[PDB]
Design a protein around this ligand. Structure first.
Ligand SMILES: *[C@@H]1O[C@H](CO)[C@@H](O[C@@H]2O[C@H](CO)[C@@H](O[C@@H]3O[C@H](CO[C@H]4O[C@H](CO)[C@@H](O)[C@H](O)[C@@H]4O)[C@@H](O)[C@H](O)[C@@H]3O)[C@H](O)[C@H]2NC(C)=O)[C@H](O)[C@H]1NC(C)=O
Ligand SMILES: *[C@@H]1O[C@H](CO)[C@@H](O[C@@H]2O[C@H](CO)[C@@H](O[C@@H]3O[C@H](CO)[C@@H](O)[C@H](O)[C@@H]3O)[C@H](O)[C@H]2NC(C)=O)[C@H](O)[C@H]1NC(C)=O
Ligand SMILES: *[C@@H]1O[C@H](CO)[C@@H](O[C@@H]2O[C@H](CO)[C@@H](O)[C@H](O)[C@H]2NC(C)=O)[C@H](O)[C@H]1NC(C)=O
Ligand SMILES: *[C@@H]1O[C@H](CO)[C@@H](O[C@@H]2O[C@H](CO)[C@@H](O)[C@H](O)[C@H]2NC(C)=O)[C@H](O)[C@H]1NC(C)=O
Ligand SMILES: *[C@@H]1O[C@H](CO)[C@@H](O[C@@H]2O[C@H](CO)[C@@H](O)[C@H](O)[C@H]2NC(C)=O)[C@H](O)[C@H]1NC(C)=O
Ligand SMILES: *[C@@H]1O[C@H](CO)[C@@H](O[C@@H]2O[C@H](CO)[C@@H](O)[C@H](O)[C@H]2NC(C)=O)[C@H](O)[C@H]1NC(C)=O
Ligand SMILES: *[C@@H]1O[C@H](CO)[C@@H](O)[C@H](O)[C@H]1NC(C)=O
Ligand SMILES: *[C@@H]1O[C@H](CO)[C@@H](O)[C@H](O)[C@H]1NC(C)=O
Ligand SMILES: *[C@@H]1O[C@H](CO)[C@@H](O)[C@H](O)[C@H]1NC(C)=O
Ligand SMILES: *[C@@H]1O[C@H](CO)[C@@H](O)[C@H](O)[C@H]1NC(C)=O
Ligand SMILES: *[C@@H]1O[C@H](CO)[C@@H](O)[C@H](O)[C@H]1NC(C)=O
Ligand SMILES: *[C@@H]1O[C@H](CO)[C@@H](O)[C@H](O)[C@H]1NC(C)=O
Ligand SMILES: *[C@@H]1O[C@H](CO)[C@@H](O)[C@H](O)[C@H]1NC(C)=O
Ligand SMILES: *[C@@H]1O[C@H](CO)[C@@H](O)[C@H](O)[C@H]1NC(C)=O
Ligand SMILES: *[C@@H]1O[C@H](CO)[C@@H](O)[C@H](O)[C@H]1NC(C)=O
Lengths: 1010, 49, 190, 49, 49
């Protein structure tokens, strides 16, 4: 009977302890949400007699076993491979006061529990006897601890608790975990989430796939090598865990390193199609090479031969010719056969070899260094003498040995073999590197081919995956296998019927996720890039009929939402102009980048506003970075001799980095400086808080508790989520935060209490009212109306400010643009240290460990591997930090400018510091950055009016001195061009330009004078 | 040298008197009944222990 | 275009939406002018707003009202003056194709690297894993992977650098469209 | 291949993330280049400028 | 330095974030006792010229 596990199968990796941190893992784990067979008694038994119908499973990557019998009815776990006297068999059973582990040979067990207890009278009567083993003649070992007093505390829980007893064989050191998990339950609740400690690791390492569990009712699993993301708690327990790879949410979690998935899109991976039943195609000829004087100087060819039995001819121990992997070489296909065999001896193997040097080489024989095999052992002087060798280069002969006078010439390998020139007749490998037709390999099954389905091929020895199309490319008589460009082989010409084929990469692409957020992440929407995704048939119909249809775009198919023809905004990107919510779910749609409209046009009517509002905004600029500081020496050494030796092996590189990095420290502090070093004296606002209706209680740092800070600053700090370890540090920022505060206060005070004149000389003090008046004229609006609206203007000001306050508090992520900066910084440093996990194929990731692992010599190059790995890595971070420096610096001067330009004065270049006609901006402070607020003069509540480009009166053409005409149909007026303000026409507010002559739109209205 | 700071080297508060520790106490397994019991095994009773 | 171990991913916006943004900006500038820079596009008749522009450059608008037509004509001719001189003479896309080639060239460089052995016997890792035992061939694989590795890494770097230059220029461009579209600065050479 | 990669740290993800960063950056570039008006404004068929 | 975290028999050493080992068992009495890198910093000089 199948049952679905909610949350079982969790156990720690090792002796490791952590806290509040998320860490990986991987082994044979109970995969989440799988089948489990649960049962109690298929037939009534275990209380008197024994009944049943059929009969215990094997091991499929680990075993998990438990039940609920408040009794030892669960009697034994039996681990082995044959379960007899042929393989020692491991049984682990309570000893009724203790528990014992045994691995001896015997017949079989019986029912250890019958149920009927309390005997039948005051004492034993000892009728129900019980048995485990038999005939103790061949016994290997036994073990005792106290599991009965450790594991099975099924007491005072009158019936029905829930333990678990798993098993693991992790590289032989035979570890077993356990836990007596108490969960007060009644019936049919296989739920409960916990972990396990290794009670015993019997370092046996024995043949283990059989776990006969003997007493009908037992839960079995079969663990699975999946890697999962766990979280520990300081107390050491686990709160929740996931596999890295079960569900398209599981990877999302496993990679974004959070038990929480935020709004966005996170490309995790792509997909590799599992091809089907790889193919094999080799030619038809079946014959070997000559072996007359070999087994059972010249060359020969035409060999497609089974090198097994006469390659590892037992004349050797096993065929081990350096230059040979007989493990594989029988499966490859060749193009040549070169078998050179000339009389030499065979007790001089090292002599006659690559790495050749000696009279054999120069005088007689040394073929150049090419990957080759070797020759086999035998007797030939006395198993068939006066035979001779031949300064000189290979491939060469010579007959009559001219002078080289000389000494006694000849030399014999006689029937006096006792001696280091025993007889072998040298033999050679043959091998060629793709440069030609393919013809030669020892035929195996030689399958028949398929096509048009991306399946792997070992095509004539040349392997690859993809598809097989009939290549329309008309080859030419001289082609065996080609390449489009850079490894991309194309040609597939079968070695038997000589037919040509094509290959493409069978399409694939990223897989990502589009979700709203963790607490809704139930509906993980998955994605595949630009494909006619007919190869992922497992959810299209699951998403063709919660669930409406399956909609594809020019960004690919989207299994995981549906389509809708509404026109909404762009929240999450997907690709190809289709962004993300509505109707209480996930969906996709096309983007209405705005309310599709346009205000009407006329050549006699303009849209002048009547009303306006001031408005505040925010811009948060990264200005800095933790001026990190690193050191090659300690980092790679951490006080290590060999290490520092081998680093100053590498010249000044590390020194250069240190120096350039310190350079970036210098530049960044200068950034700060040039960000604020804009006045030299320092100032304090008057305690006189008389600002004509303008409130700043959140800003002006009067003597509040925390020195001289801003209410806004406090709101800022912990709104940023904001420690040194080793190898690196953070040389503190030079300009202390408080110094910045003071700069800001004084700088912010002077400008709003002295006008702009301080950037122009002495800080010529200024009243705020007249100030704002000047600003208004600065942006084109007349101070008259400001001096009208003082009170209401200031109120709108204050209200805007309070809105910005609660916005900050109740608009999260509004500090993203800087939280991100600190994030990039941190996580950069994080991966930086984390590298030292990477051991780069050493034996260890602590140089100390590995030097202590080996003797000096090999450890030398090994440490060099360590060196190079860690070296390139730190080198990378150097670069990448340098690049963030590049960007932050650009942004930096960008900022420093901004402050300099839209505070100390009053710009006009819009968008820079104001979302419209820009008034001015207030400065602030921030953990590694700066933030500014602004006041924009945004018009609103416009009105339509009849408008004439020019006026004629008395024939004369009167232009605006400055303004636009306007008529409400009846009367005409002149007015400033950013606020509805009709005015009367006399000689001044309109000059003239000759007679009304040529221009279009000149209307009939007389101008006046009072 | 010119007017400025220039990191020249570092230092390590040098640790003193390296020790080494390990697993509970240090003992041996039963050699008395291997080297101090009054009876033993013979030409025909010795087992490769 | 896409071959193996590489990819392209579509610009979030497609040309269509882009040109649409444009069209809007065009007409607004033709019709409402400064107001949309602040929010509500408030319409304006083109002649008068060009006349305001002439204020801004340093002349009373009256010149426009007397000159407009030829202004017009000049404008109009000036208009075509470009496309012809663009259709006829190519090579005008200088920096465009420059960054374009730089990218694509670079990408092919990336792949071309794969056609280097870095001293290991192989050019295709499959070949080496096959032709001998992995317990040995591992070392050639390491050479290969480290080489291709650092190569990729480089590619990333320089791509980032161009990213930075592109990036700053782009901000400049935003400002350019900004104070050269929604209104007229006096920033000469801007 | 990746069998022996996985003993080389996480450069892989480093550059993956950085590059994809440059992507999303270029996207936001286009944005800041263009998304500067609220609605999607339409030119009028009337053309008498 | 003093060790205030707590373990189990399955817990010998516990490193902390950035996986940096610091929790030594102290097998002679089974009292964990924590450690810390004995700190240090760069050095340099100050010279007006
Ligand atoms: C968090 O991790 C801790 C280890 O780092 C866990 O261990 C706890 O450690 C403290 C140390 O003082 C123990 O406190 C003792 O409490 C007893 C009384 O026990 C009280 O709690 C039990 C809980 O069932 C309750 O039933 C009793 O009536 C008591 O009210 C005092 O007499 C001692 O003097 C001492 O202060 C904790 O007992 C101990 N807990 C365990 C389970 O060992 C801690 O439990 C972890 N907390 C979690 C996981 O929530
Ligand atoms: C191997 O480990 C065991 C267990 O940690 C060690 O036994 C422990 O020895 C310490 C020190 O003698 C005991 O602490 C002492 O307890 C007494 C009271 O019983 C107290 O008066 C002392 O001041 C001190 O606190 C500890 O209780 C004891 N633990 C056990 C379970 O016996 C053992 O010493 C270690 N190896 C050896 C024998 O060197
Ligand atoms: C411009 O818009 C503002 C924003 O509503 C109007 O605000 C007036 O504010 C006063 C003071 O609180 C209120 O008593 C009035 O009720 C508001 N106006 C109205 C019409 O109710 C303001 O009136 C608008 N016009 C001007 C010229 O400022
Ligand atoms: C400026 O506004 C702040 C609130 O944001 C005022 O600070 C407090 O405001 C409340 C009003 O509900 C008063 O009851 C408190 O007495 C204020 N705290 C003080 C005065 O320390 C602040 O008073 C406002 N300033 C002006 C001039 O209106
Ligand atoms: C200013 O606003 C008024 C308010 O409606 C506009 O009036 C409408 O204009 C259209 C233009 O064709 C007419 O068809 C409608 O009949 C008008 N409605 C009323 C009630 O008169 C007016 O058009 C706007 N200004 C301009 C220049 O169009
Ligand atoms: C606007 O008023 C002017 C006078 O101030 C009118 O000018 C005359 O119009 C008649 C109509 O045919 C012409 O014959 C005259 O030549 C005009 N005067 C001059 C001095 O040339 C004008 O007609 C009025 N506007 C309209 C549209 O009628
Ligand atoms: C068990 O079954 C047998 C046969 O039905 C019966 O004789 C016996 O009484 C039952 N129980 C016991 C304890 O013997
Ligand atoms: C165990 O059985 C083997 C048979 O293979 C035998 O040689 C050995 O003597 C037996 N063990 C003992 C203790 O007799
Ligand atoms: C059983 O264990 C031995 C221990 O060396 C091992 O050599 C052997 O391969 C194992 N048998 C199987 C079938 O794995
Ligand atoms: C090649 O071998 C196949 C079977 O392997 C056989 O059917 C065929 O006749 C042979 N010759 C040719 C030319 O294919
Ligand atoms: C997810 O959590 C956030 C945390 O503030 C909450 O605001 C939001 O409402 C939650 N989402 C849903 C769909 O409830
Ligand atoms: C989907 O199948 C059609 C067959 O009509 C094919 O032409 C198309 O290319 C496929 N989709 C994609 C994205 O290629
Ligand atoms: C657009 O989507 C709507 C969803 O309501 C659907 O009814 C319609 O068929 C789609 N296509 C159109 C309107 O062309
Ligand atoms: C604008 O003027 C032209 C020519 O005088 C004319 O085509 C058009 O009708 C005028 N505008 C309106 C709204 O009538
Ligand atoms: C037009 O403006 C004048 C102001 O000079 C005003 O008196 C008149 O009532 C307005 N006309 C209408 C229809 O409101």
């Amino acid at each position: 009977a199948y049952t679905n596990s909610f949350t079982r199968g969790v156990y720690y990796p090792d002796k490791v302890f952590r806290s509040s941190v998320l860490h990986s893992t991987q082994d044979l784990f109970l995969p989440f949400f799988s089948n489990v067979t649960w049962f109690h008694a298929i037939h009534v038994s275990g209380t008197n007699g024994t009944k049943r119908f059929d009969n215990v499973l094997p091991f499929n990557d680990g075993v998990y076993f438990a039940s609920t019998e408040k009794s030892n009815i669960i009697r034994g776990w039996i681990f082995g491979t044959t379960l007899d006297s042929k393989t020692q068999s491991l049984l682990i059973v309570n000893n009724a006061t203790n528990v014992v582990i045994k691995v001896c040979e015997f017949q079989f067990c019986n029912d250890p529990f019958l149920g009927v207890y309390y005997h039948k009278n005051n004492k034993s009567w000892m009728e129900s006897e019980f048995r485990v083993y038999s005939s103790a003649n061949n016994c290997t070992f036994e073990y005792v601890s106290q599991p009965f007093l450790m594991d099975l505390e099924g007491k005072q829980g009158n019936f029905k608790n829930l333990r678990e007893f798993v098993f693991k064989n992790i590289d032989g050191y035979f570890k077993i975990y356990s836990k007596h998990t108490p969960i007060n339950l009644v019936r049919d609740l296989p739920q409960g989430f916990s972990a396990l400690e290794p009670l015993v690791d019997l370092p046996i390492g024995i043949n283990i796939t059989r776990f006969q569990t003997l007493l009908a009712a037992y839960y079995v699993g079969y663990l699975q090598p999946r890697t999962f993301l766990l979280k520990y708690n300081e107390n050491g327990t686990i709160t929740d865990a996931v596999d890295c790879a079960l569900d398209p949410l599981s990877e999302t979690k496993c990679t974004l390193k959070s038990f929480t998935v935020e709004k966005g899109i996170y490309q995790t991976s792509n997909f590799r199609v599992q091809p089907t039943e790889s193919i094999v195609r080799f030619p038809n000829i079946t014959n070997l090479c000559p072996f007359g004087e070999v087994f059972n100087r010249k060359r020969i060819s035409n060999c497609v031969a089974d090198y097994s039995v006469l390659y590892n001819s037992a004349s050797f121990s096993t065929f081990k010719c350096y230059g040979v992997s007989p493990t594989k070489l029988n499966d490859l296909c060749f193009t040549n056969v070169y078998a050179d065999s000339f009389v030499i001896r065979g007790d001089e193997v090292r002599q006659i070899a690559p790495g050749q040097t000696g009279k054999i080489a120069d005088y007689n024989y040394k073929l150049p260094d090419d990957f080759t095999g070797c020759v086999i052992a035998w007797n030939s002087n006395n198993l068939d003498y006066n035979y001779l060798y031949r300064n000189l280069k290979p491939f060469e002969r010579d007959i009559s040995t001219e002078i080289y006078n000389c000494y006694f010439p000849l030399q014999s390998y006689g029937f006096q073999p006792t001696v280091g020139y025993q007889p072998y007749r040298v033999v050679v490998l043959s091998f060629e590197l793709l440069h030609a037709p393919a013809t030669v390999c020892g035929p195996k099954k030689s399958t028949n081919l398929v096509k048009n389905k991306c399946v792997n091929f070992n095509f004539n020895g040349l392997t690859g995956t993809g598809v097989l199309t009939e290549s329309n490319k008309k080859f030419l008589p001289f082609q065996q296998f080609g390449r489009d460009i850079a490894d991309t082989t194309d040609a597939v010409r079968d070695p038997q019927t000589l037919e040509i084929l094509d290959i493409t990469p069978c399409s694939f692409g990223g897989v990502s996720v589009i979700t709203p957020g963790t607490n809704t992440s139930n509906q993980v929407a998955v994605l595949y890039q630009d494909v006619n995704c007919t190869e992922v048939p497992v959810a299209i119909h699951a998403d063709q009929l919660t669930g409406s249809n399956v909609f594809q775009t020019r960004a690919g198919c989207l299994i995981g939402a549906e389509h809708v023809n509404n026109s909404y905004e762009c929240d999450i990107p997907i690709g190809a102009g289709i962004c993300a919510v509505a109707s209480q779910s996930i969906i996709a749609y096309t983007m209405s980048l705005g309310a599709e409209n346009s205000v009407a046009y006329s050549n006699n009517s303009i849209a002048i506003p009547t009303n306006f509002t001031i408005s505040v905004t925010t811009e948060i600029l990264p200005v800095s970075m933790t001026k990190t500081s690193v050191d090659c020496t300690m980092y790679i050494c951490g006080d290590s001799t060999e290490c520092s030796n081998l680093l100053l092996q590498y010249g000044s590189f590390c020194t250069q980095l240190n120096r350039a990095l310190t350079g970036i420290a210098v530049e960044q502090d200068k950034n700060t400086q040039e960000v604020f070093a804009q006045v030299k004296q320092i100032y304090k606002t008057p305690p006189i808080k008389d600002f004509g209706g303008f409130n700043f209680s959140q800003i002006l740092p009067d003597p509040s508790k925390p020195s001289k800070r801003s209410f806004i600053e406090d709101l800022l700090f912990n709104k940023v989520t904001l420690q040194k370890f080793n190898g690196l540090t953070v040389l503190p920022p030079l300009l202390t935060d408080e110094m910045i505060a003071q700069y800001t206060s004084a700088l912010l005070a002077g400008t709003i209490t002295s006008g702009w004149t301080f950037g122009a000389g002495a800080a010529l003090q200024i009243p705020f009212a007249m100030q704002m008046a000047y600003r208004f004229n600065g942006i084109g609006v007349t101070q008259n109306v400001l001096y009208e609206n003082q009170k209401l203007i200031a109120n709108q000001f204050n209200s805007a400010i309070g809105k910005i306050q609660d916005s900050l508090s109740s608009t999260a992520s509004a500090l993203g643009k800087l939280q991100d900066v600190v994030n990039q910084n941190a996580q950069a440093l994080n991966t930086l240290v984390k590298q030292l996990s990477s051991n780069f194929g050493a034996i260890s990731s602590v140089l100390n460990d590995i030097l202590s692992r080996l003797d000096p010599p090999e450890a030398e190059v090994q440490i060099d591997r360590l060196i190079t790995g860690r070296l390139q890595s730190l080198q990378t971070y150097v670069t990448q930090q340098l690049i963030r420096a590049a960007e932050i610096r650009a942004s930096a001067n960008l900022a420093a400018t901004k402050m300099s330009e839209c505070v100390l004065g009053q710009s006009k270049r819009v968008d820079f510091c104001g979302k419209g006609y820009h008034l001015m901006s207030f400065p602030q402070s921030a953990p590694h950055g700066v933030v500014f607020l602004h006041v924009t003069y945004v018009p609103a509540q416009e009105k339509n009016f009849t408008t004439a480009p020019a006026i004629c009166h008395d024939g004369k053409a009167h232009f605006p001195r400055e303004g636009v005409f306007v008529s409400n149909g009846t009367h005409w007026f002149v007015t400033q061009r950013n606020f509805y303000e009709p005015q009367i026409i006399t000689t001044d507010n309109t000059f003239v330009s000759g007679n009304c002559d040529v221009v279009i739109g000149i209307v009939n209205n007389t101008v006046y004078d009072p | 040298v010119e007017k400025g700071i220039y990191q020249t080297s570092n230092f390590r508060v040098q640790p003193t008197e390296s020790i080494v520790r390990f697993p509970n106490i240090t003992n041996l397994c039963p050699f008395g009944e291997v080297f101090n019991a009054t009876r033993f095994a013979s030409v025909y009773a010795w087992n490769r222990k």
